[PDB]
């Protein structure tokens, strides 16, 4: 009764029917998923003051606690929607990440999903490509790099951005950010900050000092389009490979490696210390490598010949991707 | 005497020779096997807190405890029954369920079971696949994956709804739950009540907020359901799901948020790394158990960038590896 | 001195009715599974006596004062009692809880007094028998072999249990597997001493007289089968295998107590195994072996898994789909 | 100095060059080594009280306690001597067991050894046998198999009696032990009282209610002649496995199996309870007990044939030990 | 407000001296390895300019206000110091007891403001030498791999350096190792950007004028070498391998820091990654890895290792016994 | 400046180029190293209680403490040398031992170390066995084991005298340490004083009764010894030998009890497996560590039952392993 009075100035799209996610990501402001896209709303009486109450009520309604010291909190709401809530540590300062995720009601049988359609799209077995990955190895081929990274983004490969130290890693991440589309929902991942969006308004900074594990794993319940870790640098990278593998594509990350085949000798190291990550064969480990990165970019100093900073290989393998 | 006192309204099944089972869902009804058939019987004086009663005085009968923390509870009665008792944080509100196995009592000699035939079906053990597989496998390569999913769930293949989440997972198994015969016993195991069951009036609902999907999974061993239907699998969970299908409950079917097939057995196998005895297996083993239990995976895709929308991508059945 | 003489003539006292059974050097095992009767060991043979005088009360005093001798108690929260008796010999008690209602069994392990150079063994004729010199080969499991092949199980699972084979009755729940179990256990000879384990009341013996029902409800199912060690039963029969005691089943087994019969809830044969597996790593020792000796372990061990299905999905009936018997492995293995 | 004045009525053979070991097994007495004899020495002056403060006076000698806690200590003497001292609770009531082992002073030169006969016995390669062990194998196919096993304990063959529970191992053994030659040290290791030496004046009782393990290390540093472990039951046979590789030979023990190689089974999987035994693959597990045990007896109760009590099996495999 | 903008102006003022390199859109690191001197990267080049109104007493000043601005300090205690400047820039601060006394080095790292969307990097050429698409063969390894061959291996080892292999010189102690990594050291190039990690001023570089000397005596050669990754060497030069220290430095050549030469006590080539592996297994990451993984990681990254002897045995003298040189397995692996 | 004034005595040593190393074994007496040669100097005016003093003031240089409860000590000398002290629990009583190892200065070019010979030796590295290995193997092949053993440590092969208690493993161990060159500079590690050296005036007693085997194993990579003679091998330090041993250190003797050669290895092992690290390597690595460690293995036997007495039973040389 304490949570559902301050759920009160989101009603509108908590009752609508046809909504399906409601998000709060800072003061102000709403934005819902109706039919897989996201809509804005401005909500002035939404204070910060008020989501920071909300949390509290949200946290006492159930065996917990909210914080500073636990700033990350899952509820599920009296009516059955599951309530992710982060709070100022681990996200943006003067924010309060909010994301209600509404039970499904939908009812079909499998004669109206039928008539749906839904049957008529299983690719048989083939292995053979779909059109996208067709198009990207062309473009690859053709030596077209530019295109190719716009058109990865795009077709949401996962797209990791390797590089000795010192590289520009993160300014190309941020050039590859700006070719996702402005209405998909993006959440970064980071420790300092440096992947600000200002043309992508549906989106949440998440911080750690709390770790990029335990933010990554936030994630899976804040219905994100992409995430977007800042780096991979250990244990995390197993959680990488987990969320990747659960569906969320898109995904771009950076690592620091001396080329694309030791991106993956280098994330096989920080998956083995990752205490599930220590159980896998080394093998599997370089296996879900690959089932899981679309794409290495890596950025070279250029120094044996003075050339400067450049790509010194792009990395993309389907064919093994469609086999293992 | 208290527990007895409290069973009185059972009697009638309790006492007949021919039921193996009685079970109880909700206040006021009644569910009894007899020869591996379930008969329902409207029984007025079973209220809400008649069943209560009989949970604490079960609870008190092997000194144990039941209330909101403590919700599951296993007994032996001094008659030799069996009783497994949930009550209402862990299932369904307003509700307690409760089953008792009766001892088996049944004397054969070897001489008895061979004249009654059962000897003569001892099957050769042959890698040639069993006339269901090959209808199965039949269906699959005509490209009718309607009418293949439709019988996997009446073939009562362990089947596994696999997608991103939000690509309707949740709504495609409840389409293939209407596929199981409505007399079958079925218990949902879910965080929230999604799964709902209109047609299907031999049911319990349990629910997990330490209870857990695994301790309701192992509970459901001891509550005699045709099948188990756990929402979603998620983490060491995984592991008691194997466990449990290992065990014989055929006809589960459940959810995993995964990319693809392949990658939904990837997943399934970090989940059951997160079991301490998940643990201990060598992953090649966890690898093979996955596919000795799992007979379908259907991956369902929310068709964006193409724009085909919501489809299946791919099936996966490959009874030429279990 | 005084104190432990008064509590050595207490114990002497209860044990009177057992008197006759107790000096006589050519009985080795005595046995009391129920109120008026007892069980001897002659030559590795058991005879019945009827003693009237030695009600369900006088067990429950020689308990205590067994008990006391130890300084332990024998309570109704802890119902298994081991003990070294002032002659020297071995003394198991367990009572009802963790035994039959209205029933204490005994068993009293006797001390040698005549083997003690290597010329006593060979004149009571120990040594004329080491013939085997354990073959490489299959003796007359090949019998056994060669009835599956024929495809004549019901003579094979008759045979099994005569032969002493560890037999695993698998199955779904409510296959019938306690029944088929029950049916076995008819083929043990009458004379063999038998004790249960289980949590309720089902494997009745109507025709083995010698027997102990062990009960659980801390007393559990591994804690009974350890008990069973110092008993001196013929076979053990545990209702059925679950979690971690399918270690300490491994290790009765691998003991040498042969002629085991249980349950287990399975899918099918392979899958027993892979249960039984499971159950293994649930023990604390059971967790530091190698996932693959915990299998090699089980096959060791373990001869026939029976296989039970309820046919009514194709209308079947109750029947047997597979029995698993590979000596053969159990070979390979055992000289690997 | 409080320990020197303590070793006083030792100092007749502490002094003694010629001696090698000086020990107590019991108050009044004395055993001394001289050219790797024994000797009994009755010494009267050497109450249980006596050995009680010579323990408090070694242990306060260095950073340590001896107790009934902690009956179990280790110290070197000043003038360089090693000492072993077990209490009461650890060894037989009543005694407290002490071992004193001099430093070694000899001092040759390779050409002295070589006038000794060092260099005339080495056994070149062969896969041949020794004489003991044709002897052995003889014996055994002979079917003579009492004298097979008192010539094994006089040729101090590793001895391990098998049997189901209620067997008669521990008095195969016991018979076993009435083979060893009564001038021989021995140290029994039990948890009750059943391996009584009534013939074999040089021995010492150690008790666990400390450990097998314990009290089986505690032996190396106790000049046995051999050690007589009553049952091993659990990690202990590691370091029965690590003690008779030490080169301690002649040691006779019990384990419940079902058949010979049942034993090699079940230690096994004893071994693997050891926390240096997991570190072990199996098949080295397995490989080390060939090494080190010669000869396994089983107890048979003689049930499937009414033959009563007999021995099913020896089994000898000196050709799969000089090999591997 | 103004307690942030009176630190970030005091930061500012100390380091006026810079200011010439640090407005310039040019130039993208700006170094200052001791008293007098600033090394500035134009187009991934090294220029060197003398700034004597720069002594050491400013650069004292210009690490403690940067250690205040993110409220840190930098202490004898402490001298390694990593901060974010008010324009953007990263500044790594070594101070001297963790570098050359009388020295600061100072490395300021600047942020792009020009390669913001995919088409600005394809203008400045980003996208032109993208050719190598990772040949599954060797490139020219084989021109050193025939040297090896052709058994010259004083013309191998000057390649190797110029080539930029990773060299391990390997020996027992009092062999001569340093000495030669020293003979290596001057076949680097004069123009690259050097760091030595020392216990003991040895590796003295006086033909190299950008270099910087780390010493350790908490700081710790492992330290040291995360240092390094936030100054802009182009070869990390370590003294010696001998802990835990290994696992960084497998993880700092990983990261592509091409060209190091180290050394390492060992009785011969096989037995330096013998070595290198027990050293790798004393951090708490390299730990966690599998032997095989340690084992393939020095194979990844050690391109050379040359084995140094003492000839006084034999009566050779000071003589190499082997040089290891395996890019066909550096390469089966890395494509494995 | 503490530091440097008890350094004082040894200016003629530490000023010197030609010398790389200067070491004091106990008062009175130095040993400096020039061109791999040791030289015997006679110092009167170095007590005891100077090089206390001197051990306490390089202790302070650092910020360390040197007593009793911390017996060894590492430090780095200002003009760059670097200093190990071990004092008097830890070593010989009434003894000091300081190793002072001087910075390496030389400049040499590729093209000085060519002209001077140093790429000229580099052997084809055949599996074919070095000179001296063939002369080993000849002499066990002749049966000559005299010979051999004084031939093997001549030639500073790793050599472990094997034996049960008793048998006379350290009286061996001490005749084979005779055949060692009385030029060369020997550590001892031990726990009883056994391992007296009349005969090589330059060496360390070190003694452990927390400073333990392996510590005293790891002091003596910074202490310059030609060999170390360890008198046990027991546990843990096992790992450490191996790692000395692999890291050039060659000629150490040492014991192990055990039943035979094979059983030597087979305990070694089982030694490597107390060691935190040496738990992390495989047994096949660990066994493969002391195949290219060890060079020979000496079994004593006590000759009891054949009434033998004391012999040789075999010596284990397999060089075509290593």
Redesign the interface.
């Known amino acids: 009764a304490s949570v559902n009075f301050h759920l009160e100035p989101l009603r509108p799209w908590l009752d609508d029917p046809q909504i399906?996610?409601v998000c709060v990501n800072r003061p102000g402001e709403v934005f819902c998923?109706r039919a897989?896209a996201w809509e804005y709303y401005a909500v002035p009486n939404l204070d910060y003051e008020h989501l920071i109450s909300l949390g509290t009520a949200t946290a006492r309604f159930?065996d917990q606690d909210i914080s500073d010291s636990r700033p990350v909190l899952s509820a599920?709401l009296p009516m059955?929607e599951?309530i992710q809530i982060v709070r100022p540590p681990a996200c943006e300062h003067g924010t309060i990440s909010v994301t209600i995720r509404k039970?499904?009601?939908?009812?079909?049988?499998?004669?109206?999903?039928?008539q749906?359609?839904?049957?008529?799209?299983?690719?048989?077995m083939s292995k053979s490509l779909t059109?996208?990955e067709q198009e990207l190895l062309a473009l690859k081929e053709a030596?077209d790099?530019?295109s190719f990274?716009?058109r990865a983004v795009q077709?949401?490969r996962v797209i990791v951005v390797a590089?000795?130290?010192?590289?520009?890693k993160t300014?190309?991440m941020?050039?590859?950010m700006?070719?996702i589309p402005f209405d998909q929902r993006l959440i970064t991942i980071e420790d300092?900050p440096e992947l600000f969006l200002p043309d992508h308004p549906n989106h949440v900074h998440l911080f750690y000092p709390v770790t990029a594990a335990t933010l990554l794993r936030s994630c899976?319940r804040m219905?994100p389009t992409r995430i977007l870790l800042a780096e991979l640098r250990?244990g995390e990278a197993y959680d990488f490979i987990?969320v990747?593998?659960?569906?969320?594509?898109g995904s771009i990350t950076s690592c620091?490696?001396?080329?694309?085949?030791?991106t993956f000798?280098?994330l096989?190291?920080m998956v083995?210390?990752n205490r599930?990550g220590?159980?896998?064969?080394?093998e599997?480990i370089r296996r879900?490598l690959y089932?899981v990165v679309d794409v290495v970019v890596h950025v070279?100093?250029?120094?044996?010949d003075?050339?400067?900073?450049?790509?010194?290989?792009?990395?993309y393998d389907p064919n093994t991707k469609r086999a293992l």
Chains 1, 4 share one sequence.
């Open positions: 399906t996610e998923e897989s159930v599920i059955g599951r039970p499904s009601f939908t009812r079909r049988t499998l004669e109206d999903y039928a749906q359609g839904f049957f008529k799209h299983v690719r048989p059109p996208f030596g790099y530019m990274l716009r077709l949401e590089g000795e130290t010192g590289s520009g300014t190309l941020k050039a590859l700006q070719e300092v899976l219905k250990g987990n990747a593998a659960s569906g969320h594509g620091h490696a001396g080329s694309c085949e030791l000798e280098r096989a190291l083995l210390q599930q220590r159980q896998l064969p080394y599997i879900l089932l070279h100093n250029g120094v044996h003075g050339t400067g900073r450049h790509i010194s290989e792009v990395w």
